[PDB]
């Protein structure tokens, strides 16, 4: 072999490295102790440490990884068995903290050398079995033999040892020994790409415990050996092309993006009198002065109680003029939730809402037990509207296509954003006629909010100052906001984990009286409420109880739910002509005054 590698000297040097190196008790001695405690036989070693201690050992590791790494394994095994008298022997995984190469600059001089590259995973293959030891059985005497694989070639026996028959040994594929392999496609990082060039892609091969350690979408630093392999002209001939193909044999992956103390902090927050407003403020610091919308979105994030007999999910629609902060709110909620999806109602959209050989479930099914953010709600076609109505009413999605008949669970909360059909919101027009959506679909939303653009000058000045301040915000404030967001996420996770509020007797009486009063308002003069709204109240009440980290729904929760529902209706249920109390616009899609006027017109034309 053309290598200046003496195995014994390398092993001794590496054992010396483990014994004496100190991180600026040897660090890797502590690592071996932790290995014994945990039981995972993998030792990661930073190549920078090896370089610092020994520049020859580092140089040999980089130049001849295939020869040198096994000697490192031998050294670590010997040392570890001395210090602590395990399913497998420990395996060293040298790695570089930072990439040493760009995917675009890989060269022939790097073949069979240890390199580190950064990238984003796009595809991973299913597991590929590799034969390590073949199993043969004589087709006459049943005598069995085992042959070790040698550089991808197997020495098939020619004569049975026991009975001496020739050409009688058949390979039993499923009695052999196999190991795992996986193909991964790594895409060049957007930052390192030259301007205007398409991303480059590289092939990686992972084996044994490194399979399935990355998923598509991951951003990773990969340390491995650069390989060059010949390509056959066709499968039948032994001719090869003079230009070789390349891949990387993965050696190390680095993914580059409750505690009792944490629970104590969360409970301490939950004890504070104004936890509701604190969480609401933390929800979206950038948006300005949309307090009730933020409170509703917080309650949607917490959700109501899963009774398991009843949708427990809270649906919110934000309709308003263009140039407001609707998309920003949807983005902030999408970032916050763990199982959320951000999508658009337009059909041309990259990510679809509908389920469509591989069965592909849409965003609504993917957001099951989560929140689906739908940005261009008004731009949905009729089929998408039917799908959304089915999801919101039944919490399931039925498919009968290509011989597949099934029902998919979709228990998802919809946060939707809507714009008017005109260039601006029309005060003369109601909500239904401002946004061209069926009233049947609108009646499935618990809360509808209106984000109108004021004509006030003082509002313009205040918003301008807000935006300028944000344009000049400092890094410490941004970090503080990030910490508050993390606290909010942990609080919501804990509440979902351990809190299941239930209705107390006083809450029940409060809800019944609330519904009766809402009905009375209309009954005094029309109808001012319908039973579905009562259900909404219950959900909201439960959500509020969950914010306090309380297992009992109290009267305060009911009062808050009533206030929020009454504010949303006052925002979105107002008839531009006369007043608000009329909810017939939601139930029938036509204003009561409009209905009377149309009746008059029809009667007159009938005259």
């Amino acid at each position: 072999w053309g290598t200046d590698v003496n195995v014994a000297a390398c092993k001794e040097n590496f054992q010396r490295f483990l014994q004496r190196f100190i991180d600026p008790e040897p660090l890797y001695m502590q690592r071996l102790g932790e290995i014994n405690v945990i039981g995972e036989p993998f030792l990661n070693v930073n190549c920078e440490h090896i370089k610092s201690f020994d520049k020859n050992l580092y140089r040999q590791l980089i130049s001849y990884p295939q020869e040198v790494i096994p000697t490192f394994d031998m050294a670590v095994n010997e040392i570890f068995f001395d210090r602590y008298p395990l399913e497998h022997q420990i395996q060293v995984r040298p790695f570089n903290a930072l990439k040493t190469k760009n995917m675009r600059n890989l060269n022939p001089e790097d073949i069979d050398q240890l390199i580190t590259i950064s990238g984003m995973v796009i595809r991973t293959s299913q597991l590929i079995p590799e034969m390590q030891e073949a199993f043969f059985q004589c087709q006459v005497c049943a005598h069995t033999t085992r042959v070790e694989m040698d550089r991808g070639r197997i020495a098939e026996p020619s004569v049975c040892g026991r009975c001496h028959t020739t050409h009688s040994m058949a390979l039993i594929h499923n009695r052999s020994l196999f190991s795992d392999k996986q193909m991964i496609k790594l895409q060049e990082s957007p930052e390192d790409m030259p301007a205007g060039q398409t991303p480059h892609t590289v092939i990686l091969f992972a084996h044994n415990d490194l399979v399935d350690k990355v998923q598509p979408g991951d951003r990773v630093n990969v340390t491995g050996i650069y390989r060059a392999v010949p390509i056959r002209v066709n499968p039948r001939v032994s001719n090869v092309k003079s230009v070789y193909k390349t891949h990387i044999d993965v050696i190390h992956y680095r993914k580059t993006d409750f505690s009792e103390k944490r629970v104590e902090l969360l409970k301490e927050l939950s004890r504070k009198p104004d936890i509701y407003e604190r969480l609401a403020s933390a929800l979206a610091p950038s948006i300005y002065e949309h307090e009730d919308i933020k409170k509703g979105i917080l309650l949607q994030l917490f959700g109501g109680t899963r009774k398991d007999f009843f949708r427990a999910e809270i649906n919110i629609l934000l309709c308003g003029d263009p140039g407001t902060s609707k998309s920003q709110l949807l983005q902030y909620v999408y970032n916050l939730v763990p199982r959320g999806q951000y999508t658009s109602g337009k059909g041309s959209s990259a990510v679809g809402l509908t389920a469509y050989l591989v069965l592909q479930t849409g965003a609504l099914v993917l957001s099951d037990n989560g929140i689906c953010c739908i940005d261009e709600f008004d731009k949905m076609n009729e089929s998408t509207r039917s799908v959304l109505h089915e999801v919101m009413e039944q919490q399931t999605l039925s498919i009968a296509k290509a011989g597949i008949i099934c029902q998919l669970n979709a228990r998802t909360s919809v946060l939707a954003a809507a714009n008017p059909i005109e260039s601006q919101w029309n005060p003369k027009k109601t909500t239904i006629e401002n946004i061209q959506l069926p009233h049947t679909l609108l009646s499935r939303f618990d809360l509808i909010f209106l984000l109108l653009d004021p004509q006030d000058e003082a509002y313009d000045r205040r918003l301008a100052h807000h935006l300028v301040a944000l344009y000049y915000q400092s890094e410490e404030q941004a970090e503080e906001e990030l910490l508050d967001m993390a606290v909010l996420k942990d609080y919501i996770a804990y509440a979902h984990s351990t809190i299941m509020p239930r209705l107390s007797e006083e809450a029940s009486q409060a809800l019944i009286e609330a519904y009766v009063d809402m009905r009375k308002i209309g009954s005094s003069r029309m109808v001012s409420a319908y039973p579905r709204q009562l259900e909404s109240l219950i959900r909201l009440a439960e959500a509020h109880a969950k914010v306090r980290l309380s297992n009992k729904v109290e009267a305060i929760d009911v009062e808050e739910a009533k206030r929020l529902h009454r504010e949303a209706l006052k925002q979105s249920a107002t008839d531009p002509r006369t007043g608000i109390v009329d909810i017939s616009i939601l139930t029938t899609g036509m204003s009561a005054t409009s209905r009377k006027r149309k009746e008059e017109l029809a009667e007159a034309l009938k005259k």
């Binding site: 796009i122 957007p190 790409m193 205007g196 060039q197 002209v233 337009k346 990259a350 990510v351």
Partner: protein, 205 residues
């Protein structure tokens, strides 16, 4: 294009590059290649089946890509530079000034080094024959990295090649919905998202 004979289609040649002549040429550059014109050797049974005809290639040997100044910068330089945009066009003084801003493009970073969008978007709406296409054609020739496209000349790519550049969209109201969605997302996120049967990918735009 200017060298193709009348009523013909441009031809192409294959260039094989080795060693230190690599990484010199990129798509889109104008190059002068010195090399050797050779036939492609077949192999195996394909030698026998194919006759006396051969494909060709060029074996690359050399690839070649193809205080007065302060005084010009010192005085009334904004007016002078704007007036120099398409001088053969008359009367669009303020539009020409706006197009110069689109070329410099505004500051890309916040005061703290955070990345912010500097690119400036302009739309020229007007009645026919007011030199809209002439102005767009001029900006394409001046811009170092740019792509000119028509509403129906291409659909379903030019944006990627125009990254860090200028994308001149002529006949902007003739495009389809799919093309409109792509333009909308570029003016929002400065990227293009594609989905190959569920395999997502994001490109810089």
């Amino acid at each position: 294009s200017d060298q193709v004979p009348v009523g013909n289609i441009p031809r192409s040649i294959t260039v094989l590059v080795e060693g230190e002549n690599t990484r010199i040429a990129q798509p889109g550059d104008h190059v002068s290649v010195t090399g050797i014109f050779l036939p492609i050797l077949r192999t195996g049974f394909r030698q026998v089946v194919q006759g006396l005809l051969s494909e060709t290639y060029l074996e690359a040997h050399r690839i070649v890509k193809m205080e007065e100044l302060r005084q010009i910068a010192e005085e009334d330089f904004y007016e002078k530079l704007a007036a120099s945009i398409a001088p053969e066009i008359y009367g669009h003084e303020d539009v020409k000034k706006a197009l110069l801003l689109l070329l410099v493009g505004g500051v890309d970073q916040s005061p703290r080094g955070m990345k912010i969008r500097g690119n400036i978007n302009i739309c020229l709406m007007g009645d026919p024959g007011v030199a809209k296409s002439q102005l767009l054609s001029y900006i394409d020739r001046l811009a170092p990295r740019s792509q000119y496209t028509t509403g129906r000349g291409s659909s379903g790519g030019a944006l990627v090649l125009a990254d860090q550049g200028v994308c001149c969209i002529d006949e902007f109201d003739k495009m389809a919905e799919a093309d409109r969605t792509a333009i909308h997302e570029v003016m929002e996120q400065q990227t293009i998202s594609i989905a190959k049967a569920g395999i997502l990918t994001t490109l810089n735009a």
